[PDB]
Design an enzyme around this catalytic site. Structure first.
Site, PDB file in Angstrom:
ATOM      1  N   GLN A  19       0.789  -1.235   0.000  1.00  0.00           N
ATOM      2  CA  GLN A  19       0.000   0.000   0.000  1.00  0.00           C
ATOM      3  C   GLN A  19       0.818   1.281   0.000  1.00  0.00           C
ATOM      4  O   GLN A  19       0.261   2.373  -0.056  1.00  0.00           O
ATOM      5  CB  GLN A  19      -0.954   0.028   1.198  1.00  0.00           C
ATOM      6  N   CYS A  25      -4.994   0.751   3.950  1.00  0.00           N
ATOM      7  CA  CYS A  25      -5.071  -0.639   4.376  1.00  0.00           C
ATOM      8  C   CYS A  25      -6.507  -1.135   4.269  1.00  0.00           C
ATOM      9  O   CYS A  25      -6.738  -2.284   3.897  1.00  0.00           O
ATOM     10  CB  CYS A  25      -4.560  -0.813   5.816  1.00  0.00           C
ATOM     11  N   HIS A 162      -5.203  -0.519  11.833  1.00  0.00           N
ATOM     12  CA  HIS A 162      -4.744  -1.143  10.601  1.00  0.00           C
ATOM     13  C   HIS A 162      -5.768  -2.190  10.156  1.00  0.00           C
ATOM     14  O   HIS A 162      -6.379  -2.868  10.978  1.00  0.00           O
ATOM     15  CB  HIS A 162      -3.368  -1.780  10.848  1.00  0.00           C
ATOM     16  N   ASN A 182      -0.867  -9.241   5.233  1.00  0.00           N
ATOM     17  CA  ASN A 182      -0.693  -7.797   5.395  1.00  0.00           C
ATOM     18  C   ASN A 182      -0.569  -7.163   4.016  1.00  0.00           C
ATOM     19  O   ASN A 182      -0.603  -7.861   3.007  1.00  0.00           O
ATOM     20  CB  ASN A 182       0.574  -7.499   6.207  1.00  0.00           C
TER      21      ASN A 182
HETATM   22  C1  LIG Z   1      -4.699   1.854   6.998  1.00  0.00           C
HETATM   23  N1  LIG Z   1      -3.655   2.079   6.194  1.00  0.00           N
HETATM   24  N2  LIG Z   1      -4.764   2.558   8.228  1.00  0.00           N
HETATM   25  C2  LIG Z   1      -4.501   3.999   8.009  1.00  0.00           C
HETATM   26  C3  LIG Z   1      -5.410   4.765   8.990  1.00  0.00           C
HETATM   27  C4  LIG Z   1      -6.171   3.704   9.750  1.00  0.00           C
HETATM   28  N3  LIG Z   1      -7.556   4.163  10.065  1.00  0.00           N
HETATM   29  C5  LIG Z   1      -8.685   3.614   9.510  1.00  0.00           C
HETATM   30  O1  LIG Z   1      -8.744   3.369   8.305  1.00  0.00           O
HETATM   31  C6  LIG Z   1      -9.928   3.346  10.429  1.00  0.00           C
HETATM   32  C7  LIG Z   1     -10.390   1.900  10.243  1.00  0.00           C
HETATM   33  C8  LIG Z   1      -9.257   0.971  10.571  1.00  0.00           C
HETATM   34  C9  LIG Z   1      -9.117   0.863  12.096  1.00  0.00           C
HETATM   35  C10 LIG Z   1      -9.546  -0.399   9.983  1.00  0.00           C
HETATM   36  N4  LIG Z   1     -11.075   4.249  10.105  1.00  0.00           N
HETATM   37  C11 LIG Z   1     -10.907   5.551   9.670  1.00  0.00           C
HETATM   38  O2  LIG Z   1      -9.948   6.228  10.043  1.00  0.00           O
HETATM   39  O3  LIG Z   1     -11.803   6.074   8.852  1.00  0.00           O
HETATM   40  C12 LIG Z   1     -11.863   7.486   8.925  1.00  0.00           C
HETATM   41  C13 LIG Z   1     -13.254   7.934   8.545  1.00  0.00           C
HETATM   42  C14 LIG Z   1     -13.978   7.221   7.587  1.00  0.00           C
HETATM   43  C15 LIG Z   1     -15.255   7.628   7.241  1.00  0.00           C
HETATM   44  C16 LIG Z   1     -15.822   8.749   7.849  1.00  0.00           C
HETATM   45  C17 LIG Z   1     -15.105   9.460   8.798  1.00  0.00           C
HETATM   46  C18 LIG Z   1     -13.818   9.052   9.149  1.00  0.00           C
HETATM   47  C19 LIG Z   1      -6.080   2.438   8.911  1.00  0.00           C
END
Ligand SMILES: *C(#N)N1[C][C][C]([N]C(=O)[C]([C][C]([C])[C])[N]C(=O)O[C]C2=[C][C]=[C][C]=[C]2)[C]1
Length: 215
Positions: A19, A25, A162, A182
């Protein structure tokens, strides 16, 4: 539910991707879940486009983050996701360029695994196939992981950061685990994979945000 399941032995999994620096991710975790269902349903294994999700699922934050759920709902409502081939990964958010001709898979929505239930995650992995999950991969030990069953007691199930793919699970010398694919490239961990502790009280919250696409 079998004692151990490895969908890599059934051709449900494509190669490990990278990525880059983009926080997509969630896109790779979703695509991986889709690829598994596409193979199980159509019999063919194809590389789906994560870039398509990053660029088109405006319900998420592109390289900033997003949820596998919105990802699945998008593929559904959009009536398909392009192949990695028809929608190449570039590692940065760009304007949506979805092309129906390059449509490689469809989705009827998604299902969510009971929050925190590893036993339910286990049965789901066996009944459906590879599942998308969220874990706490913020630790030094997680980054320099090389082999064996991963278990760091500093992991926090409430600190999901993640998204990865559980292509199976099993046991290594009595240590139960989850086979995790991963998206940090083949040079990370054990060829892109890591065995994460299973039944160790939801280590890293690997079952706090588990889901899979209906197909
Ligand atoms: C990957 N690469 N990583 C980078 C940041 C991290 N954060 C997220 O994607 C999380 C979900 C994971 C824990 C699976 N969610 C997120 O940050 O979404 C932000 C969002 C989405 C929609 C509306 C408001 C905010 C994963």
């Amino acid at each position: 539910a079998p004692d151990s399941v490895d969908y890599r032995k059934k051709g449900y999994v494509t190669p490990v991707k990278n990525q880059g620096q983009c926080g997509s991710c969630w896109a790779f975790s979703s695509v991986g879940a889709l690829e598994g269902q596409l193979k199980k349903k159509t019999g063919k294994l194809l590389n789906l486009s994560p870039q398509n999700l990053v660029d088109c699922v405006s319900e998420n934050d592109g390289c900033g983050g997003g949820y596998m759920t919105n990802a699945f709902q998008y593929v559904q409502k959009n009536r398909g996701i392009d192949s990695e081939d028809a929608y190449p990964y570039v590692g940065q958010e760009e304007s949506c360029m979805y092309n129906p001709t390059g449509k490689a898979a469809k989705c009827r929505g998604y299902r969510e695994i009971p929050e925190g239930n590893e036993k339910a995650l286990k049965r789901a992995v066996a009944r459906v196939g590879p599942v998308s999950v969220a874990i706490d991969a913020s630790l030094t030990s997680f980054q320099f992981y090389s082999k064996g069953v991963y278990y760091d007691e500093s992991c926090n199930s409430d600190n999901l950061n993640h998204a990865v793919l559980a292509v199976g699970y099993g046991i290594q010398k009595g240590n139960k685990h989850w086979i995790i694919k991963n998206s940090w490239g083949e040079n990370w961990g054990n060829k892109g994979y890591i065995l994460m502790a299973r039944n160790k009280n939801n280590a890293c919250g690997i079952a706090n945000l588990a889901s899979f696409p209906k197909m």
